[PDB]
């Protein structure tokens, strides 16, 4: 007969948004795993080596736009 | 400018061999310039060639028959 010349898939990477808008986070909490900057780091958000976006401070996550970039901010909690 | 990068360029006397001399400056070495012809000495735009063309078919007809 014949055989299948496909069959290989990589393991699941479980990317995506981990903390959504208005969610209270600690400093250092990961907000989104991503490849590239689909989201950019905003105010109080840092970007990791693998483009992970993490909270630089305590507060609430918000998603927005800064200039032309789609950003994630962590607004300090009042 | 920089030192030790460019060739020597000093004052120079020239001759155009057509009653023309100038006080330009050129890259030559320990001597003078002797050029064949200049622009004002040239026969192009002073009108001394008048080549046009030679297309007298009827002119040659009349010269060699009449």
């Amino acid at each position: 007969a014949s055989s299948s010349r496909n069959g290989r898939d990589s393991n699941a990477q479980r990317l995506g948004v981990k903390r959504f808008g208005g969610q209270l986070v600690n400093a250092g909490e990961i907000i989104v795993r991503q490849r590239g900057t689909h989201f950019h780091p905003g105010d109080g958000v840092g970007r990791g080596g693998d483009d992970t976006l993490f909270a630089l401070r305590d507060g609430n996550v918000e998603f927005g736009t800064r200039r032309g970039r789609r950003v994630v901010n962590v607004t300090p909690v009042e | 400018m920089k030192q030790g990068i460019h060739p020597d360029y000093r004052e120079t006397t020239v001759v155009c061999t057509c009653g023309n001399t100038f006080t330009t400056r050129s890259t030559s070495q320990s001597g003078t310039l002797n050029a064949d012809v200049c622009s004002k000495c040239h026969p192009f735009y002073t009108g001394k060639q008048k080549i046009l063309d030679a297309g007298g078919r009827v002119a040659r007809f009349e010269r060699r028959y009449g």
Binding site: - | I5, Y9, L33, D36, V37, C38, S39, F44, Y45
Partner: protein, 184 residues
């Protein structure tokens, strides 16, 4: 020395007066002028040896008076025996008084002593007042020696002028003084 080149003074007085009277611009700083001279040399036959490039550098430095921009190959082409990064051309940009004196020396000395010289074409305009022409030889420039040339080479001389249209650029170059014929 401290003396404005004769071409520059003649340009200013005669040519500015002529363009003001003949084209009649409504603003004083609209009269076109010579922006720069560009001497290019495609040295494409230098992928196999580098001494011909020493010759090219010497020839065009003596012609222009400044060291050239040696340009490396942009992209590799196999139809061309051409790789990437090998320098395959050299050009000199003359601006300021140097452009004027190079233009004067070219006009008075270089192009008139071409074999069976017949002027230069006036149909070589790019469409914005800038006029380019090519020389198949480099031996007309009498400021260089004769019995020590390595190999035959040519160049492209480009006049970039601040002339909006082709007609006033042609007028500018003609009034500066160019051998212009009436043939194609």
């Amino acid at each position: 020395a401290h003396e404005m080149p004769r071409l520059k003074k003649q340009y200013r007085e005669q040519i500015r007066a002529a363009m003001q009277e003949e084209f009649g611009y409504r603003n004083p700083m609209l009269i076109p002028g010579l922006e720069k001279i560009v001497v290019n040399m495609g040295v494409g036959d230098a992928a196999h040896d580098s001494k011909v490039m020493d010759g090219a550098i010497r020839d065009i430095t003596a012609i222009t008076g400044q060291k050239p921009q040696v340009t490396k190959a942009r992209k590799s082409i196999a139809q061309f025996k051409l790789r990437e990064g090998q320098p395959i051309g050299c050009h000199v940009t003359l601006r300021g008084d140097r452009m004027w004196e190079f233009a004067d020396r070219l006009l008075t000395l270089a192009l008139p002593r071409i074999r069976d010289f017949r002027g230069l074409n006036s149909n070589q305009f790019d469409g914005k007042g800038n006029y380019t022409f090519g020389l198949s030889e480099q031996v007309m420039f009498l400021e260089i020696d004769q019995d020590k040339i390595d190999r035959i080479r040519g160049m492209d001389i480009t006049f970039v002028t601040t002339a909006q249209t082709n007609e006033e650029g042609k007028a500018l170059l003609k009034h500066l003084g160019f051998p212009f014929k009436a043939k194609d």
